[PDB]
Amino acid sequence: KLFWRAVVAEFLATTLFVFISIGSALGFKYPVGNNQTAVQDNVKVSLAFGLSIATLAQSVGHISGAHLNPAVTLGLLLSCQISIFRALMYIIAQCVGAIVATAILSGITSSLTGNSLGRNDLADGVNSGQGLGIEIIGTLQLVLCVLATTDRRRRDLGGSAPLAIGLSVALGHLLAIDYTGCGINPARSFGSAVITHNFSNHWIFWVGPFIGGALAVLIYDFILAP
Amino acid sequence: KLFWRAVVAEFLATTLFVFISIGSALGFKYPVGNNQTAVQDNVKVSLAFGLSIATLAQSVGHISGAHLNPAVTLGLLLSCQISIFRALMYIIAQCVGAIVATAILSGITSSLTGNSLGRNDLADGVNSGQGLGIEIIGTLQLVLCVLATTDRRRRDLGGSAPLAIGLSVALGHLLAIDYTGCGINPARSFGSAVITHNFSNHWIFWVGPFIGGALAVLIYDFILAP
Amino acid sequence: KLFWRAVVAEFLATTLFVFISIGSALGFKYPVGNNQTAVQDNVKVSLAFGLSIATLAQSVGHISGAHLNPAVTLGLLLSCQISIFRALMYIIAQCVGAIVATAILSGITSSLTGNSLGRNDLADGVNSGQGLGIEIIGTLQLVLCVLATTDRRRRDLGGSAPLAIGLSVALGHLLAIDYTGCGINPARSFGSAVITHNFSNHWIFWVGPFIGGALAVLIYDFILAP
Amino acid sequence: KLFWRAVVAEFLATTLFVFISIGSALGFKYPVGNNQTAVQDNVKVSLAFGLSIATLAQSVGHISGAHLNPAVTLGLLLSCQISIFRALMYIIAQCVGAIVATAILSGITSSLTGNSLGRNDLADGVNSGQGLGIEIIGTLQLVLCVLATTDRRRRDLGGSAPLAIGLSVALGHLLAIDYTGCGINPARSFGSAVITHNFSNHWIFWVGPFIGGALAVLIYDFILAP
């Protein structure tokens, strides 16, 4: 029964997550153009995405669904069994949540209109192929810490891990951000794209996190043999 | 006897809280107009409100009154008994403290006068109905974490929760802020309004936190049955 | 023997502390005038003073001298005995350290010269009597948390308190800063003044922290009877 | 067998570290000149280097190789035996990693070209001999905390230390930064220099950390006798 509140636990959560995130960012560009946000001061933006996850993680399901992206899950699968690993649901959740996440935004935020957007949070690029690697190295540590944190002992009473992970993820963004918006999570993309998505990129983004996370568990496995 | 230092514990605290908060914010707009604060760099502002609560929470009453807003309390009530739940006092406290909080400000801060104010920290709006939801989603996690943190085990010797909660609350603000100033707390409103409060808003603000927190404990209850 | 490394432990530490602090701040105003620092972005400045203390506290003497200001110490005295409480040394230390702290600065930092200074970090004021209270409310929580943290259990293996206290102190600054530079510590003043100190203020600053801390332990005592 | 994944553990890690670090920094100066980054808002930059290490440390080898610089290691040696202390490898690692770290950068980041660089992250200087001391005082606490944290008890289940150390190191940067870029680590230098390194400085930088760390363990030893 749990596996189901579990999904919703994330269906919901993730939504809340991406809304805030997309909240603050857009939060900053808005009253009449040229005053503070000609081009918004990046860390707070990082902070929003950053801190967010750790809170939302400290609250939701614990040993089970807490996270909010596909890369983490597979990193997990990687072992001997898919007999119970129907984590593919988690992804569809993480995806559907994102859409009512971006959707609920346009609803309120509906006057943000110069050559108006609330833009593809990511694949925009005044770059070419560089965009690719950057994110793939970042999730590498995220997934890394995500599993590190887990080895012997499970969930908190001192709450370090979540605070940890959250700010860890934050790191991704400080950097992730400029070149092509923050990319450590699949869901974050669809929601943005749902309007007009022009880059073959935002998903070369996905395979990225996977692969970043691919060598991530591969390098975390040989660390010392399970 | 405790229930009473308890109230004062918060009467006082909260006051200290909102003063700092209103301190820094106003802190930034002031020497002669056009120099740094044409429109103040938002996160530190978030930081003040943000960090503040966690300190003030780590210090005051522990199992009992530590918090500083009405939404948290009801989230608590929600169970089977008001036989001892005269938490309505806590609210009047949280309200009275706020007034000597804003009051003590005008006393010192008394030269901040262009078309001078120390403004309705919140309901200002270059928006319409959007303002409503935004805050209602934010307190959702605050109250969420506030109760999550509490389930089995009570108060700290490793002090995570408070540090947690504080920065959690901080999240609310990073975002909460731009559209219509930070709104996760009833008290924060009166104190600001005490001068000239023009919006039917700042309290549609209250019912908001409640309702955000309303579905908040409702969703935290079905999480797994008490 | 310990009481002595203890003092030096702080003699030294505090020095290191105030140097960094005075480091970053001055750090920001310097290459040729009008480019980034017309008037330096305040939180990092807060961060330096802020984070600093928590590190330096996590490292130095533990049950004993860790702190770096006079207000904390007296808050401590307040009990029944000065038979062993010759904490007045600690102050002279905290004072002497500050001078080689500011001194060692002028040595390196020696080209920072427009109408050049590395100014009275604090009492400057485009204000009058407001400056007074502001800091007195801030140390109130610092001292508060400083003692809260201590009640039943002593020093860390999970290291929360220091991280706590540090960022707690940080709070003071975010706000403390603008009106008249950050004021939660006696030492910080002398070192700055050692050159040309014009305000009857910077020490009405001292009596402030004391008194802030005075009612601080008085309110922390009645909290629940020792 | 461990001593070897150990080195790679750092060979790799450190690389990841310096890339992000050099990532964000460069991250900020780039789209067409005069828009936000005329001269980049320093703390986030601090954050990247800052938070980074704590994550990467929370994930890699634990009792053993976690760190990412030469100063920490010797501080360690300092005791009675080099029979097993072939930590000189660690340095060559920390050095080689840095080069594929800066290298992999130029590969992606390859359009950042005004009078283009991705500059000597450090020894630049509109100063003379001041540059020298500044960093030597900073690592003093880093190494300090690095060893403090270690005394009686080893590695985390509450994860404080790493979070600690990371932000501790962050402190170095907030300040370290302006005068001559952040300097608390040997590796960080080579990678930058690998192109065109003009200062006798960046290594007077090394002897610095050592010596900062030299008196660092000397002062941490007399603290209380091993």
UniProtKB/Swiss-Prot annotation, chains A, B, C, D:
It is found in: Cell membrane. The chain crosses the membrane at residues 5-22, 40-58, 84-102, 127-146, 157-174, 200-217. The water channel activity is inhibited by P-choloromercuribenzene sulphonate and diethylpyrocarbonate(DPPC). The glycerol channel activity is inhibited by P-choloromercuribenzene sulphonate, diethylpyrocarbonate(DPPC), phloretin and Cu(2+). Inhibited by mercury. A motif (NPA 2) lies at residues 185-187. Detected in erythrocytes (at protein level). Expressed in a number of tissues including erythrocytes, renal tubules, retinal pigment epithelium, heart, lung, skeletal muscle, kidney and pancreas. Weakly expressed in brain, placenta and liver. Residues 62-75, 180-192 dip into the membrane without crossing it. It catalyses: H2O(in) = H2O(out); nitric oxide(out) = nitric oxide(in); CO2(out) = CO2(in); glycerol(in) = glycerol(out). The record marks C182 as: Hg(2+)-sensitive residue. One of its GO terms (molecular function) is glycerol transmembrane transporter activity. Aquaporins contain two tandem repeats each containing three membrane-spanning domains and a pore-forming loop with the signature motif Asn-Pro-Ala (NPA). This is Aquaporin-1. It comes from Homo sapiens. The gene is AQP1. The chain holds residues 8 to 233 of 269 of the full protein.
